[PDB]
Design a protein around this nucleic acid. Structure first.
Lengths: 107, 95, 93, 78, 95, 78, 107, 93
DNA sequence: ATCGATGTATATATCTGACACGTGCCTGGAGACTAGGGAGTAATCCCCTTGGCGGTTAAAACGCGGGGGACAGCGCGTACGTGCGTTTAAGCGGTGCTAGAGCTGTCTACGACCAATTGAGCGGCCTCGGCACCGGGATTCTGAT
DNA sequence: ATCAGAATCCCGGTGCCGAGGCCGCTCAATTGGTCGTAGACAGCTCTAGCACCGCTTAAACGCACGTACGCGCTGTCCCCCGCGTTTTAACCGCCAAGGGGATTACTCCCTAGTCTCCAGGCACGTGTCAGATATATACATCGAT
C-alpha cells in the first residue's frame, strides 16, 4: 500500500486530527461523527492555542524572560477583553492578578 | 522616620499584586481542610496536589471577594472595607 | 501506563510562533487544561445542536455553529476562517 | 484550626485585592466565608471519592468539584 | 387632597409585587425586537410565542437588576436609585 | 424604537423591583442595559435559526439562547 | 405469554420507567444503561413533582383557589430555601415576585 | 404529529397529593419544563461520573451520586430514600 | 384624637371559555430468548501518604502612640413625586393572503466496521543553560522642614 | 524647593535542576474494502405570520407646585496603621513504615439486539363549572388639624 499520510498533514495542521476524531467518537456526543468535524475542531483549537501562546511570549519578552510561565499566561488572557470573556469563570494557578489600584485611594 | 498611614498599605498592594506566591500558610490550611473534611467521612487521606488545588481555589475566591468588597466600600464613599461590604458583595453575587 | 497529552502539539505551535521561546511545565499543564476545556465546550454545544435538530451526526456545520455561539467576536471570525480553510485543504487532498 | 488563618494572611489577601484600609471585624467575617466555601468544595470532592470507592481525595476530585460549582481551575490536570 | 411623597410609590410597589402581568407594551417591545434582529439577518419572521418569551425574560432580568440597584442605593445611605448604583450592581454581578 | 420603552414602563418595573424613588438618568441607563441584553439573546436565537435553515425565530430558539446564557426560562416548551 | 405488566406498576411509580429508559439510551449519555437507573430516576422525578405540587396546592388553598397557576408555583418555590436554591437560575413565566419591601423605605 | 409530554403523570401525582385541586395549562407547561430540566441535569451528571471512572454503564449508583451532588440537603435525603425503595420493589418484582 | 377622603378588600350575580373526561387508534413498550463483553473479585506490588525529630529563622502576636477617617449633625436648593388636563397610539376584532414550516418519498453519498501494517507518540535517561539567589551600587520616592 | 533616609531596581557572579533532546518500543492511527441508512432534495399541503382598516379608551405626556432628600461642610473621637520587641511554630530535611491505589487475570451475569404483540397514551371532541368582570359596599389607612 501507499505510505501512511496523517490527516493532520493532509489538513496542514499540527494538532492531531485522528486523536480529536477518536475523542469525539468515544466522548458520548453523537451517534456518528462526520469526516470534517475533527479537522474543523483541530483547526479551531490550534488557532486559539497559537493566539494565547503568541500573547504570552510577547509578555515574556517584555519581562526579559525566555520561558512562558503561568504569570505570563494570566497577563495575556486578562489583557485581552475577548480572551478574558471566554475564560471568565476560569482560575489560572499561580497567575496572580493585574496591578490595579482604584484612583480614589491614591495619595 | 514614620511613613504616613496609607503609604505602606499602598506599597503592600503593589507588592502582592506583582507577586504570585500563595499567601496562606500551608500547614494551617492543610489542618483546616482535614478538620472540615472529617465531618463528612472518617480516615480520609489527602493528596498533596489535592490540598494545593484547594488552597489555590480558596485564595482566588477570597481575592475576588475582597475586590468586590472594596468596590462596595468605595461606592459608599468609604475607603475601609467592612462586613456590610462583604455581605452586599455576596448578596449581589447570588451566594 | 501511558497517559496521552497535547504537550507535543502545543510545543510545535510555540516553536512556530516564537522560535526562541520555551515553556515551563506548569504553563504546559495550563495549556493542556485549556485545550481540554475548549474541546469539551465545543463538542458539547455541537452535540446539543444535533439533538435539537433531530440529527445523529456531528458535522462541520455543527462545529462551526458551536464556534460562532461560544467564541466572542473576532475570535469566532478567525476561528471560522481557519476551520474552513483546513476543511477545504483536507477535502482537496 | 480556623484560627490558623491568621489576621496577617487575610490582610495579604486584601492587599492583593486592592484593599487599603481594613476594619477589625473583617477577619471574622472572612473566616466564616472561607469556611462555608471550603465546606461546599470538600463535600463535593468527598462525594466523588466515595463514588470511586477510594480513601484518598485526589486533585481530580477537587478539580471536578470546582468545575461543577462554576469555579474552573486550570493547572492541576484539568 | 394630596398624599405625601412616598405613599403612592409604596402603593404601586405593593400592587406590582402582587400582580403578574407584563408591564412593557407589546407593540413597542415587538418593534424593538425586530429592529435589533434586523442587524443580524434580514427578512426575519418571528413567532408570537418567541416575542412573548423575549418579553418575559427581559422583564424578569430588569426586575432582578432593579432589586440589586435598590440594595446598592440603601448601602450608600440613599433612597434614590442612580446610574452609579446600576453600574455597581452589574459590575459585581459579572456582566 | 428603543424609546417605546417609556418612562412609566421603567417605573413599573422598578416598582416591582421594590424601588421607591427614581433618578431621571435611570431611564436612559435602563434602556441601554435592556438593549444590550436583547442584542445578546437575539443574536444567539438567530444563530440557532440560521443553523436550522429556518426563516422564523422560534420559541425553542429563544429558550435555548436563554438557557445557554444561564437564564433558563420555564413555560415555553423547555 | 403473560399479561403485560409495566415497570412503573412493578416499582409502584406513576412516572414512566420505560419512557425514561428510552430517553436515557437515546440521549447520548452512556454506551449502556443499567436496569435500575430508569427506576431510580423516575422515582426521584416523581418525588420532586409531588413536593412542588403539594406546596402549590397549599398556596392555592390559601388564596381560596382550586386551580394551580404559575403564581402559585413561583410562591411555592421561592418560599422554600432549598427549592429556591435548586431553581435559583430559573425564571417561571407569569410567576411574578415575592412581596418584599425594605424596612428602611417604610414611613 | 405526536408530541410526548409528562402531562398525564404530573396530573396523576397532583390527584394523589391534592384530590380536589386541578391545574392550569400554563402551570402544566411549567411543570413539564421542570421535569425535563431535572432529567437533563441528573443524566448529565451521571454521564460525567461514568466517564470519570472509565465506566460505560450508567447505574443506580451513578444516579444516586448525581442526586446527592445536585439536590440540596433534605431534598437529596428524601429523593435517595424514594429511589432506593423503588429499586428494591422493582428488583423484588 | 378625629373625621373626612379614599383606595382597597369583600360579597354576590352573570357569563364564558378552558379544562377535565371520553374515544379510537397506532406505535412504542413489554415478554421471551440469545450472545458476549464489561464489571466484579482476588492477589500483588510499589509508591506515596502519614508520622516523628530537630533546628532555626521568619513570621505572628502584642503594645503603643497618633492621625486620619468614619460618622453624626445641619443647612440649602433642587430635582422628583403627585395630580390634572390633553393627546397619542396601543389594543382588539375582522379579514387576506401568501411565505414557509412541516411532512412524505426516493435514493445516493457517506460513515461505521473490520483486518493488517507500521510509524507516531510516550516513558526513561542525560545534560547544559535559564533562572534564582546573593550582594552591592543607583535610582526613586516620601515627609519633615 | 530641599534633603536625608528608606525602599526598590538593576547589574554582575555562581550554581543547580529542570527543560529540551535522543532513543527504544508498542499500540493506535492509517489504508483498503464493504454495506446499510440517513439526510439531501423534490414536491405538496395548509398554518400562521404579516399587512391593513377602524374604533375605543386607557396609557403616555406635558406642566405646575411643593417638599423631602441628596449633598456639601464641620466637628469629634476612636480605632486602625505602622513600628519595635518577643515568641512560636512553619518549614526544610531526613528517615520509617504501611496501606491503599493501580494492575492483571479469570469468570459470569447483565445488558444490547431481535421479534412479536398489544395496550397505553395521545389528537380530537365536548360540555359544564371555576374564575373573570361588574357593581355595590365596607373598611382600614393616610393626612391635616
Amino acid at each position: 500500500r501507499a505510505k501512511a499520510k496523517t490527516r493532520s498533514s493532509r489538513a496542514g495542521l499540527q494538532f492531531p486530527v485522528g486523536r480529536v476524531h477518536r475523542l469525539l467518537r468515544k466522548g458520548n456526543y453523537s451517534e456518528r461523527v462526520g469526516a470534517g468535524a475533527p479537522v474543523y475542531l483541530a483547526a479551531v483549537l490550534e488557532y486559539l492555542t497559537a493566539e494565547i501562546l503568541e500573547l504570552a511570549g510577547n509578555a515574556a519578552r517584555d519581562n526579559k524572560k525566555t520561558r512562558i510561565i503561568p504569570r505570563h499566561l494570566q497577563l495575556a488572557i486578562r489583557n485581552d477583553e475577548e480572551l478574558n470573556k471566554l475564560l471568565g469563570r476560569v482560575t489560572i494557578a499561580q497567575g496572580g492578578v493585574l496591578p490595579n489600584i482604584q484612583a480614589v485611594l491614591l495619595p | 522616620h514614620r511613613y504616613r498611614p496609607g503609604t505602606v498599605a499602598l506599597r503592600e498592594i503593589r507588592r502582592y499584586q506583582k507577586s504570585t506566591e500563595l499567601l496562606i500558610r500551608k500547614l494551617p490550611f492543610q489542618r483546616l481542610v482535614r478538620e472540615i473534611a472529617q465531618d463528612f467521612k472518617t480516615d480520609l487521606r489527602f493528596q498533596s496536589s489535592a490540598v494545593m488545588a484547594l488552597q489555590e481555589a480558596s485564595e482566588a475566591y477570597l481575592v475576588g471577594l475582597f475586590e468586590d468588597t472594596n468596590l462596595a466600600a468605595i461606592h459608599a464613599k468609604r475607603v475601609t472595607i467592612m462586613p456590610k461590604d462583604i455581605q452586599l458583595a455576596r448578596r449581589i453575587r447570588g451566594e | 501506563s501511558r497517559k496521552e497529552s497535547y504537550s507535543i502539539y502545543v510545543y510545535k505551535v510555540l516553536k512556530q510562533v516564537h522560535p526562541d521561546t520555551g515553556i515551563s511545565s506548569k504553563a504546559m499543564g495550563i495549556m493542556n487544561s485549556f485545550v481540554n476545556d475548549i474541546f469539551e465546550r465545543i463538542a458539547g454545544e455541537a452535540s446539543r445542536l444535533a439533538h435539537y435538530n433531530k440529527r445523529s451526526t456531528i458535522t462541520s456545520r455543527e462545529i462551526q455553529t458551536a464556534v460562532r455561539l461560544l467564541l466572542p467576536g473576532e475570535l469566532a471570525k478567525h476561528a471560522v476562517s481557519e476551520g474552513t480553510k483546513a476543511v477545504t485543504k483536507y477535502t482537496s487532498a | 484550626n480556623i484560627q490558623g488563618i491568621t489576621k496577617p494572611a487575610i490582610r495579604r489577601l486584601a492587599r492583593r485585592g486592592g484593599v487599603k484600609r481594613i476594619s477589625g471585624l473583617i477577619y471574622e467575617e472572612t473566616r466564616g466565608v472561607l469556611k462555608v466555601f471550603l465546606e461546599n468544595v470538600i463535600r463535593d470532592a468527598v462525594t466523588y471519592t466515595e463514588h470511586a470507592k477510594r480513601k484518598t481525595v485526589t486533585a481530580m476530585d477537587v478539580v471536578y468539584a470546582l468545575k461543577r460549582q462554576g469555579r474552573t481551575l486550570y493547572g492541576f490536570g484539568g
